[PDB]
Amino acid sequence: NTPKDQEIKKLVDQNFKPLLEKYDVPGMAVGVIQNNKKYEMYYGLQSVQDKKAVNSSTIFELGSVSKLFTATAGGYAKNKGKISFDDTPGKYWKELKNTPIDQVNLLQLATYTSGNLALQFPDEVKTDQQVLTFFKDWKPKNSIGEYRQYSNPSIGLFGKVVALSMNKPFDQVLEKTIFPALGLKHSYVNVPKTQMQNYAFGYNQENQPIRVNPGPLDAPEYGVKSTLPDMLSFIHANLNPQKYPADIQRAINETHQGRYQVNTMYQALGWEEFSYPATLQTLLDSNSEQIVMKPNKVTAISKEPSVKMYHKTGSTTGFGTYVVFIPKENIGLVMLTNKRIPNEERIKAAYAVLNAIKK
C-alpha cells in the first residue's frame, strides 16, 4: 500500500541520510532511475552560510566522474573516424612525435596502462607548456600495456588528443558537442557567472567552504560540474543508447566495452564494469588501495559477461560523487555530496538501495 516513490525515498533515508551526520556532510542529492521513471531526493544545504537548500538546480563538482564524459567524447571521435584507438598521441599533438610517450596508444592512455603515469601530474606542472614538457620528458618504466595504474594525466592526455582530433578545445568538445548530444543543459566545464548562484560550495574535512581550483588538463580529468537531473539524464543515456543518433549511440557503447580485467573488475572506457549480480565485495575491491593506488598486471577478458553493471566514484577536495547503472534491470543511481565521504560508504549505500527496490 506504499507507492514506489515513497518506497525509494524510505530506502534512501535508511541508507544515505545517516551518512550526513556520520561524516558531517552539509548537502547531498540522491537520484534513482527505474524503468524510465526518475526519483530525486535532496538533503541539507548547498551553502551553509547562505542557508541555501540543495535542490534540482544545485550544481556539484563530479571529480573523476568527469572521466566518463571524456570517455564518451573519445568514443564519439572514434566512431566519427577522427581517431583510432591504435593511434599514438604524436599523430595529433605533433610535438610528441618521436618521444617515448608516442609509443603508447590511445586505448592504453585511456585505460591507464602506459606503465609510468602516476595518480596526478606533479604539483609544479601547471601551464600548457609545462604539460607538453612533462610528456616530452616522460620515459617508460614498466612494459607498455601490461600494468594498470589509475592515472589522471593518462586519461587527461587521451582527452587532449580527442580534442585535437575534433579541432576544438576540450571544454568546447563537451559544452558544444557532447553535452548537447546527450540532452544535458545544466552541465558545465566552466560555470558561467549567471549560474554561480547555483554552484554549491564544497566543504573540506574541517567543514570549510571551497571549490575546485584550476589544474593541468583539469577539464578531461575532473572538470565537469552538473546537477542531479542532468546526471539522471546521463544515466538514462547509458541505459538506453538506442535513443540517440548513430554517432552518440556508438560512443556510449564504446564506453561500455570491457577492455581487460584486473580480477573481478573489467576496465571499460571510463566506466568500471562487473558481472551482475555483483557481490558487495567485488564492488568494494574496485576501490581498494591495491587497485586504486598500486600497479596491477592486466589480464585478457575471459568471461564476457552477458549481464553486467557499471560504476564510477569521483571526488574533488570538496565533493563526492558515485554513479552506478544495471542495464538489464533498467535501473541506476547517482549520489552527489558537497563533502567527501569514503568511497566504501557510497558503494555500500547504493548497493543496499538498488538491491531492495522492488522490480
Author numbering: 1 to 359
Direct quotes from the study:
Class C Acinetobacter-derived cephalosporinases (ADCs) represent an important target for inhibition in the multidrug-resistant pathogen Acinetobacter baumannii. The class C Acinetobacter-derived cephalosporinases (ADCs) play a significant role in antibiotic resistance in A. baumannii. Many ADC variants have emerged, and characterization of their structural and functional differences is essential. X-ray crystal structures of ADC variants in this study provide a structural context for substrate profile differences and show that the inhibitor adopts a similar conformation in all ADC variants, despite small changes near their active sites.
In contrast, ADC-30 and -162 form a tight turn that restricts the active site with the Leu216 side chain oriented toward the interior of the enzyme, and the side chain of Asp217 forming hydrogen bonds with the main chain amide nitrogen of Gly214, both presumably stabilizing this turn. Overall, the variants that do not contain an Ala insertion showed little to no change in their Ω-loop conformations upon binding of the inhibitor MB076.
